[PDB]
Ligand binder design. Sequence first.
Ligand SMILES: Nc1ncnc2c1ncn2[C@@H]1O[C@@H]2COP(=O)(O)O[C@H]2[C@H]1O
Ligand SMILES: [Mg+2]
Ligand SMILES: [Mg+2]
Length: 233
Amino acid sequence: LVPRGSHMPEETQTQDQPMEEEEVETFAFQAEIAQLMSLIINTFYSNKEIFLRELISNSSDALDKIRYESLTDPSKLDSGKELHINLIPNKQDRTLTIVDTGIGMTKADLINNLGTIAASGTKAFMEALQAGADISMIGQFGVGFYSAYLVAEKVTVITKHNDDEQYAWESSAGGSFTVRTDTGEPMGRGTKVILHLKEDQTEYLEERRIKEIVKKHSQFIGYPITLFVEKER
Ligand SMILES: Nc1ncnc2c1ncn2[C@@H]1O[C@@H]2COP(=O)(O)O[C@H]2[C@H]1O
Ligand SMILES: [Mg+2]
Ligand SMILES: [Mg+2]
C-alpha cells in the first residue's frame, strides 16, 4: 500500500536481541591474601617482570591437565583446539592478555582458587618479603597469581571449563573481587587473564620486552607460545 524501492539503514536495522541478565557476586579476599595484595601493590620491587612467568606457569599447569584428564575422560582427545598460549598486548587499551586453551575454571573454582581460600605459605611469604626476599620467590609459596598486581591496577579473568558456563572474575584489589556470568564473546575452553597495566608499567606492551622476559624466565612451557603484535599504523 506504501511502495518503497530503497530503505535507509536505520529503517531496516534489526531489533536488538533480548537483553541478557548476568548474575554478579562479590567476595572478600581471605585476610592474608588481602594483606599480601596490599603489600605487593604498594611496595617497590626491582624484578617485577616475573609476573609473566607466574601466569604462564599457571597456563602450562592447566594445559598439562588436558593430557591427564584424557585418561579418565577420552573425549577431550576429540577436541580440535591446539594446546597453546597466546600473549596479546593492546597498546590502545594498555592491556596485556595471557590466553590459554587449558582446562579452564568453573564458577566455584574462581571463588575458591582466586581469593577465598587460604594458601598455607602466605604468612611465611610475607615474612620472607619483610626480611628482604626477592619477589621472584612468590611462586614457591603458592600465591604466584597475585604477582599480576606488580604491574596491573586491575585484573579480569575470563574462563570456560567443560563442566560449567563462561565466567568473569575481576578485582582492583582493595579487599574484594567479583565473579559474574559472562554472556559476551564465547571464548571456548580455557582462560584469558587480562592485565590492566599501571601507567608506569607500559613496557610490558612492547614486543622486544615481552620476548626478553619469556626467554629469560619461561623456556620450559612445554606448549607453543605465540606473541600477537598489532601492526603499527
Ligand atoms: N590459566 C589458568 N587456568 C586454570 N586455572 C588457573 C589459571 N590461573 C590460575 N588458575 C587457578 O588458580 C590457582 C592458583 O593457585 P594454584 O597454582 O595452586 O592453582 C591455580 C589454578 O587452580
Ligand atoms: Mg605450582
Ligand atoms: Mg611443565
